[PDB]
Chain A
Amino acid sequence: TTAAPLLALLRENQDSVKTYALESINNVVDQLWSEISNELPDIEALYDDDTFSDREMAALIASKVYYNLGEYESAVKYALAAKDRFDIDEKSQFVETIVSKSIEMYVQEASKQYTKDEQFYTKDIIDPKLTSIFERMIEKCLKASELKLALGIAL
């Protein structure tokens, strides 16, 4: 009902307890995220720790908070660095949102770099985490047997 007993273990030690804790928290984030939004500074602080190997769990939990906050840009950057929670095969309102969020973002970032160089798509100028999204999106369009959706995004 309340996330207070779940958020109390976030500031404690013994990260092995946080392994089963973040699994129980991630299920109720779609509900109690309004209360979790106050603990965001504590979630992002533990993400940069090298001895903390559960950072992939906090990447999806922190992304769902900004999902209903109105800013979808923050949820994309945290989910891509983990390279796990991002799956194009999973079809849901939340998963398809972060996959489609990188469409216009890839266009806006490429249009600014298009003036300096037209070969930017062959280099690392564009974020490889964002570059893989544009590559995996076409692979999903090719399986749908529709060439108007694939060529429309690449245009």
Chain B
Amino acid sequence: MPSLAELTKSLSIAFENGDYAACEKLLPPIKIELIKNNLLIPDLSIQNDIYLNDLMITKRILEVGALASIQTFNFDSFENYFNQLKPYYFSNNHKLSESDKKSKLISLYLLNLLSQNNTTKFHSELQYLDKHIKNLEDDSLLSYPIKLDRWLMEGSYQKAWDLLQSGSQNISEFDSFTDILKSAIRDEIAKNTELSYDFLPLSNIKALLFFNNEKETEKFALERNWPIVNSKVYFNNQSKEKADYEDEMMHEEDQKTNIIEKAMDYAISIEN
């Protein structure tokens, strides 16, 4: 939805007027003109353009593009626009006007990263921040995923689930990463319920994982291969197998007798 002759005015005005699906139609013509002059990333040399011309406007162009895909429920494009915003609010020292300005978009990457059940890259991005005890610790927006992951590591999923509900930030921007992260939390709990619960009834699974329907509760048990009996749910899946391909390693089957004798023959050749 174009508005004025400038590509920035058409993107900024159409963002607050709604229609996020039609607002993304102006993305291709903007990036074509910016890539020719290499205005998407800051140059290592000195072109005598820093806070002037379109480079100061360019950081606001990709800022709207990242906020355009958050309302369309797209995690593939959000990772692409976030990679271009990492050099922003990084270069030009720490001081522009508000520095990082919006703190909610920075926390969107930390919350969406936990949806893939990867705990290694979560703490790696916290080290990328320049000020750990200033912007990260004091502000509750950057400290939101830290306090959220803290209850996840301590083992309490009930207090961590309340942050996605009682919090007032789940209306607009965080609404996209709320249900997506909640689905990853419930899937992580399902791994715990196998070993930690030998037998549990149907009414408790609805209350523990915060389900609104009893019939939907049994639907999740079918994809997870959970045996269901009257007023009870067992787990026969505690035994594990397969897991890609393995040979003569990690509790083999028919080679158990041979490997024991093979290990005795390996030390003889080392001495010989």
**Interface SS of chain A:** helix
Residues in A with CB closer than 8 Å to B32 are 14, 16-17
Inter-chain contact B36/A20, CB cutoff 8 Å? yes
Segment of B47-55, B76-84, B152-160, B247-255 in the binding face: B76-84
Residues in A with CB closer than 8 Å to B41 are 5-6, 24
- Whether, in the assembled complex, B104 has its beta carbon less than 8 Å from a beta carbon of chain A, the answer is no
Q: Chain B CB within 10 Å — which of A2, A4, A11 has the most?
A: A4
Q: Give B26-52 interface residues, CB cut-off 8 Å to A.
A: 28, 31-32, 35-36, 38, 40-41
- Whether, in the assembled complex, B227 has its beta carbon less than 8 Å from a beta carbon of chain A, the answer is no
Tell me the bound Cα distance from A2 to B40 in angstroms.
13
What mask results when residues 3 to 14 of chain A are scored 1 for a CB within 8 Å of chain B, else 0?
011111101111
**Interface SS of chain B:** helix
- Closest residue on chain B to residue A3 by CB atoms: B83
- What band does the interface of chain A fall in when counting residues whose beta carbon is under 8 Å from B? 10 to 19
Inter-chain contact A14/B87, CB cutoff 8 Å? no
- Whether, in the assembled complex, A21 has its beta carbon less than 8 Å from a beta carbon of chain B, the answer is yes
Inter-chain contact B35/A5, CB cutoff 8 Å? no
Residues in B with CB closer than 8 Å to A119 are none
- Closest residue on chain B to residue A23 by CB atoms: B38
- Closest residue on chain B to residue A17 by CB atoms: B35
- Whether, in the assembled complex, B9 has its beta carbon less than 8 Å from a beta carbon of chain A, the answer is no
Given A8-B80, A14-B32, A17-B31, A24-B38 contact (CB < 8 Å): yes
Tell me the bound Cα distance from A11 to B80 in angstroms.
9
Inter-chain contact A12/B80, CB cutoff 8 Å? yes
Given contacts A1-B90, A8-B84, 9 further A-B contacts (CB under 8 A): A2-B86, A4-B86, A5-B87, A6-B41, A8-B79, A8-B83, A13-B28, A14-B31, A24-B41
User: Chain B residues in contact with chain A, CB under 8 A?
Assistant: 28, 31-32, 35-36, 38, 40-41, 79-81, 83-84, 86-87, 90
User: Chain A residues in contact with chain B, CB under 8 A?
Assistant: 1-2, 4-9, 11-14, 16-17, 20-21, 24
**Residue contacts A-B, CB under 8 angstroms, 14 given:** A2-B87, A4-B86, A5-B41, A5-B84, A7-B83, A8-B79, A8-B80, A8-B84, A9-B31, A13-B28, A17-B32, A20-B35, A20-B38, A24-B38
